[PDB]
C-alpha cells in the first residue's frame, strides 16, 4: 500500500493553501506558519517559533489542516536555509494528529517511542516513515530539543486520500 500511497500532499506544491497552515507562535510575520513548506525560500525561509524550544516544555507546534481524512505514510522536515545563512532547525520532533480537530492523538511507533529523530542541519530534507501510518485531517509537528534552541521548520506530508 505505501508503494502507491506516498504522494506529497501539498506543502511544497501549494495544494495545501496558506489558511490551512497555522502555528503556536511565530518569530515574525516572515517566519509565520505558511512559510514552513518543504524546500521553500519564501518569506524568511521557514516557520519559526517566537521563542526557543525548551527540552522539558514542548509547547510549540506547526499545524496542517487537510480537511478530508488522509493516510499519512511519511513526513519530511528541513530547517531554515535562508539563502545559505540560516542555522535554525528542529533536531527532533513529535507528531500529534486528529480526525475531528478536538481530540489529539500522540503518534507512537511500534515500540512506543513518540520522539522522532529529525534534522542535523538547516538545509537537508530528512524523511521518516510512519509505522504505523496514520489517518488524520489535522497533523501537528511538535519540535523537540535536548537544550534551549531557536528552531525553525519546513515540512511536507506524504500519503493519499482516505477512502
Amino acid at each position: 500500500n505505501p508503494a502507491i500511497c506516498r504522494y506529497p500532499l501539498g506543502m511544497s506544491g501549494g495544494q495545501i493553501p496558506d489558511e490551512d497552515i497555522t502555528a503556536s507562535s511565530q518569530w515574525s510575520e516572515s517566519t509565520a506558519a505558511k512559510y514552513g513548506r518543504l524546500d521553500s525560500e519564501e518569506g524568511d525561509g521557514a516557520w519559526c517559533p517566537e521563542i526557543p524550544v525548551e527540552p522539558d516544555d514542548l509547547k510549540e507546534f506547526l499545524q496542517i489542516d487537510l480537511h478530508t481524512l488522509h493516510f499519512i505514510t511519511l513526513v519530511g522536515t528541513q530547517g531554515r536555509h535562508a539563502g545559505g545563512h540560516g542555522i535554525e532547525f528542529a533536531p527532533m520532533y513529535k507528531i500529534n494528529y486528529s480526525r475531528d480537530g478536538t481530540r489529539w492523538i500522540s503518534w507512537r511507533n511500534r515500540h512506543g517511542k513518540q520522539v522522532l529523530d529529525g534534522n542535523s542541519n538547516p538545509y537537508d530534507i530528512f524523511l521518516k516513515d510512519l509505522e504505523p501510518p496514520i489517518v488524520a485531517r489535522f497533523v501537528r509537528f511538535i519540535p523537540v530539543t535536548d537544550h534551549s534552541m531557536n528552531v525553525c521548520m519546513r515540512v511536507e506530508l506524504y500519503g493519499c486520500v482516505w477512502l
Binding site: 515574525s28 535562508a82 539563502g83 545563512h85 542555522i87
Partner: peptide, 28 residues
C-alpha cells in the same frame, strides 16, 4: 494638449530579509 505630468512615485519596496543569526554564546 500638453502631456500630463510624470506619474507619482511607485509603492514602497518589500521588507528586507531577516538579519543573520547572532554569534555563538560565550563559554560555559
Amino acid at each position: 494638449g500638453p502631456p500630463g505630468p510624470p506619474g507619482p512615485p511607485g509603492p514602497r519596496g518589500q521588507p528586507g530579509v531577516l538579519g543573520f543569526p547572532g554569534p555563538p554564546g560565550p563559554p560555559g
